[PDB]
Amino acid sequence: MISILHYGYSFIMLLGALYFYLLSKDPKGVPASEYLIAMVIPLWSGAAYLSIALGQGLFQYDTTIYYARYIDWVISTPLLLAALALTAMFGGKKNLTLLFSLVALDVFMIITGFVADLSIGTTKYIWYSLGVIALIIILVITFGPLRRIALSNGTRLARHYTRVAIYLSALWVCYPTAWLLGPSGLGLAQELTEVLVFIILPIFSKVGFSIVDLHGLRKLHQS
Amino acid sequence: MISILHYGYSFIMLLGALYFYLLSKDPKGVPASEYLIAMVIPLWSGAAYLSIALGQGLFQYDDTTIYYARYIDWVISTPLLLAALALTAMFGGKKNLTLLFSLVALDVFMIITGFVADLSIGTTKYIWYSLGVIALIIILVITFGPLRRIALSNGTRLARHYTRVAIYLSALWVCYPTAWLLGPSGLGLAQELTEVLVFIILPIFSKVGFSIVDLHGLRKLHQ
Amino acid sequence: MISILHYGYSFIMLLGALYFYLLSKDPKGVPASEYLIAMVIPLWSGAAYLSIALGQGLFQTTIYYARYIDWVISTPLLLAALALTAMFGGKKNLTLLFSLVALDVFMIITGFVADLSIGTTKYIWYSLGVIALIIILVITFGPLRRIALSNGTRLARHYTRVAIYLSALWVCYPTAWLLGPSGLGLAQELTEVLVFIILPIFSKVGFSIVDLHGLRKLHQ
Numbered sequence: 001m002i003s004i005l006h007y008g009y010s011f012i013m014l015l016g017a018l019y020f021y022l023l024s025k026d027p028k029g030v031p032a033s034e035y036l037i038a039m040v041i042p043l044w045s046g047a048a049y050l051s052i053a054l055g056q057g058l059f060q061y062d063t064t065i066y067y068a069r070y071i072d073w074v075i076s077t078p079l080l081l082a083a084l085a086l087t088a089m090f091g092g093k094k095n096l097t098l099l100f101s102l103v104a105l106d107v108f109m110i111i112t113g114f115v116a117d118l119s120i121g122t123t124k125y126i127w128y129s130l131g132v133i134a135l136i137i138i139l140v141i142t143f144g145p146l147r148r149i150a151l152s153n154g155t156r157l158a159r160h161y162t163r164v165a166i167y168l169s170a171l172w173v174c175y176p177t178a179w180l181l182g183p184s185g186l187g188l189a190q191e192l193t194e195v196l197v198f199i200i201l202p203i204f205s206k207v208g209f210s211i212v213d214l215h216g217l218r219k220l221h222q223s
Numbered sequence: 224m225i226s227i228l229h230y231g232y233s234f235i236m237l238l239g240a241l242y243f244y245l246l247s248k249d250p251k252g253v254p255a256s257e258y259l260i261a262m263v264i265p266l267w268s269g270a271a272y273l274s275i276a277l278g279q280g281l282f283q284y285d286d287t288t289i290y291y292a293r294y295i296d297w298v299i300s301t302p303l304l305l306a307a308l309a310l311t312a313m314f315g316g317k318k319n320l321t322l323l324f325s326l327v328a329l330d331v332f333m334i335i336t337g338f339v340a341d342l343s344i345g346t347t348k349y350i351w352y353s354l355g356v357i358a359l360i361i362i363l364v365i366t367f368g369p370l371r372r373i374a375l376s377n378g379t380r381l382a383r384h385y386t387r388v389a390i391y392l393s394a395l396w397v398c399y400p401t402a403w404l405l406g407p408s409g410l411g412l413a414q415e416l417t418e419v420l421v422f423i424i425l426p427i428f429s430k431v432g433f434s435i436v437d438l439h440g441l442r443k444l445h446q
Numbered sequence: 447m448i449s450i451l452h453y454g455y456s457f458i459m460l461l462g463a464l465y466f467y468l469l470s471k472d473p474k475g476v477p478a479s480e481y482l483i484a485m486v487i488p489l490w491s492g493a494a495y496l497s498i499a500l501g502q503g504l505f506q507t508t509i510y511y512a513r514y515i516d517w518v519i520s521t522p523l524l525l526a527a528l529a530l531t532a533m534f535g536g537k538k539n540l541t542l543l544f545s546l547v548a549l550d551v552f553m554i555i556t557g558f559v560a561d562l563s564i565g566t567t568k569y570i571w572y573s574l575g576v577i578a579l580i581i582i583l584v585i586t587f588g589p590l591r592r593i594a595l596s597n598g599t600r601l602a603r604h605y606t607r608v609a610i611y612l613s614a615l616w617v618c619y620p621t622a623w624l625l626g627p628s629g630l631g632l633a634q635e636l637t638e639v640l641v642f643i644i645l646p647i648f649s650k651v652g653f654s655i656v657d658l659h660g661l662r663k664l665h666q
C-alpha cells in the first residue's frame with residue numbers, strides 16, 4: 001500500500017506540473033520565474049516520492065527512515081519560501097537578502113530533521129528543537145518584515161499574500177507535528193498513519209499552494 | 224591503461240583551463256563570467272577524472288564497476304556548459320536567467336537520474352534512464368526552440384555562431400546516454416574498455432572543444 | 447574534554463551571531479547582505495561543531511568530517527564577506543567573488559578527499575588544495591586589493607587590515623592539517639582539536655567583528 005500511495009502521489013505531482021506549465025503559456029502578468037518555481041517543486045517532490053515507491057528512497061535504522069523525504073524538502077521547501085517571498089515583492093523592488101535569509105533558515109531546518117531522524121534519545125530532540133527554532137524565525141519573518149513588503153505593494157497584493165502566508169504557515173506547523181507524533185519521534189502514530197499524512201499534506205503544499213498563489217497573482221492582471 | 228588514460232585526460236583539462244585563462248587576459252568584448260565558466264568546466268572534470276586515475280572515483284556494484292566520479296563531474300560541468308550556451312544566445316541582448324536556470328535544473332536532474340539508474344537493477348534502472356532522456360529531449364527543445372529565438376533576437380551574426388555551438392554540443396549530448404545504455408551500466412553490449420575510451424574522448428570535445436569554438440566565435444564579433 | 451570544548455565553541459558562535467544581528471538593527475550604511483553573511487558563518491559552524499560535541503560529526507585515525515561540512519559553507523562566505531569589503535562604495539565584481547567561492551569550495555573538498563586518502567594520494571589532494579589557497583591569496587593581495595584601492599584610502603586601509611587578518615588564519619589551517627593526525631602525525635590529536643577550536647573563533651566571529659566595525663566607521 002505504501003508503494004502504491006507513492007506512485008499515486010508522483011502522478012498527481014506530474015499533473016500539477018503540467019497545469020502550471022499550461023498556465024505559464026498565458027502568464028497574465030506573472031513573471032516566468034514564478035511559473036518555473038511552481039513547476040520544479042512538484043516535479044522534484046514527484047521524483048523523490050517515485051524513489052520511495054520503487055523501494056530505493058528508504059532504509060532500516062529496526063525503524064524505517066524515508067530519507068527521500070529530506071532530499072525532496074531540502075529543494076522543494078526553500079523554493080516554496082522563494083515563491084511566498086516573490087509574492088510579497090510582486091509589483092515592487094525585490095529584497096533578495098530577505099529571500100536568501102528564508103532559504104538559509106529553511107535548508108538548515110530540513111537538515112536538522114534528517115540528523116534528528118538519524119539520532120536517538122536527547123540528541124534527536126536537540127536537532128528537532130533547532131529545526132523548530134528555525135521555523136519560528138521563518139514565521140516571524142513571514143508575518144513581520146515580509147508582510148510589511150507585501151503591504152508596501154498595495155491592498156490587493158497584501159490581501160493575497162496574507163491568504164497564501166496563512167495557507168503555507170498552517171501546513172508548515174503540520175510537518176514537525178506529524179514528525180514528532182510518528183515513528184521518527186514519540187511513536188504514538190502508526191507507520192501507515194504517518195505515511196498517509198506525508199502523502200496528503202504535500203499535495204496541498206506542492207500543488208495546492210501554487211494553484212492558490214498563481215491564481216491570486218493572475219487575478220491582479222489588467223486586461 | 225584505464226589509469227594512464229585518466230592521467231592524460233586531467234593534463235589536457237589543465238592545458239585547456241590555462242588556454243582559457245590566457246584568452247581571458249585579452250578578452251575582446253567577452254565578459255569575465257564566460258571565461259570563468261570556460262575555466263571551471265575543465266578544472267572540475269580534470270579533478271574528478273584524476274580521482275579515477277588514482278583508483279578512488281570508482282567502486283564495484285552488481286559485479287560491475289561504477290565510475291561515480293563521472294556523475295560528480297557532470298553534475299557541475301554539464302549545467303555550466305548549458306549556462307555557457309545560454310549566455311551565447313543572450314550575447315549583446317537582455318539576459319533570460321529564468322530560461323538559463325530552467326536548463327540548469329533539467330540538466331542536474333538528468334545527471335542525478337543517470338547516477339540512480341547506475342545504482343539500480345532491472346526495470347527500475349530503465350525508469351530512471353528514461354526520466355533522464357525525457358529531461359535531455361526538453362533541453363534539446365529549449366536549445367533549438369526558445370533559446371535559438373533569443374539568439375535570433377540578437378542579430379544574424381550572433382545567431383549564426385549560436386546555431387553552430389548548439390549543433391556541436393547537441394551532437395555530443397546524445398552520445399552520452401547512447402554509450403551509457405550500450406555499455407556495462409545498461410544493456411552491456413559494449414566492453415568496459417570501449418566505454419572508458421568513449422568517456423575519455425567525448426569530454427575532450429565538450430570540456431575544451433566547445434569553449435574553444437564558443438569563445439573564438441564570440442571574440443570574432445569584437446572590433 | 448573534546449566534547450566540552452565543542453559545546454563551548456558552539457555557544458560562542460551563537461553569541462557572535464546574536465551580536466551581528468543586533469548590529470544589523472542599526473546598520474550604519476552597511477547593506478543587510480553583509481550582516482546576513484556575518485550571521486550565517488558562525489551559526490553554520492556552531493551547528494557543525496555541536497554535531498562533534500554530541501559525538502556524531504566524526505568517525506574512527508579519527509576523521510572530524512563535520513569540520514569539512516562547516517568549512518565548505520563558512521569559508522566561501524568569509525571570502526564573499528572579504529570581496530564585498532573590497533567593493534564597498536563601488537561597483538561589484540561578482541565574477542571575481544564567485545572565482546574565490548569556486549577556488550575555496552574546491553580547496554575544502556581536496557582536504558576531505560586527502561583525509562580519506564593514504565600515502566602519496568593524500569599529498570596529491572593536499573597539494574591541489576594548497577595551490578587553490580595560493581591563487582586565493584594572489585587574488586586577495588592583487589586584483590581584489592586593486593578594487594579596494596579604487597574605493598578610496600579609508601576603505602583600502604580597512605580592506606588591507608581584514609585581508610592580512612584572514613590570510614594569517616588561512617595559512618594556519620593547512621599547516622595544522624599537515625602536522626596533525628590527518629597528515630604527518632607529528633602533532634597530537636588533542637593539540638589539533640584545540641587549534642581547530644581556537645583558530646575558528648578568530649575567523650568565524652573575530653573577522654566579522656573587525657570587518658563590520660571598520661565598514662560601520664566609514665558611515666562617519
Ligand SMILES: CCCCCCCC/C=C\CCCCCCCC(=O)O
Pocket residue numbers: 033036037040044075318319320321322324325327328329331332
Ligand atoms: C533540480 C533542482 C534544481 C533547481 C535550481 C533552479 C530552480 C529555479 C529557481 C529559480 C529561478 C531563478 C530565476 C531568476 C530570475 C531573474 C530574472 C530573469 O532574468 O529571468
Ligand code: NA
Pocket residue numbers: 257306307308309310311312437
Ligand atoms: Na557563452
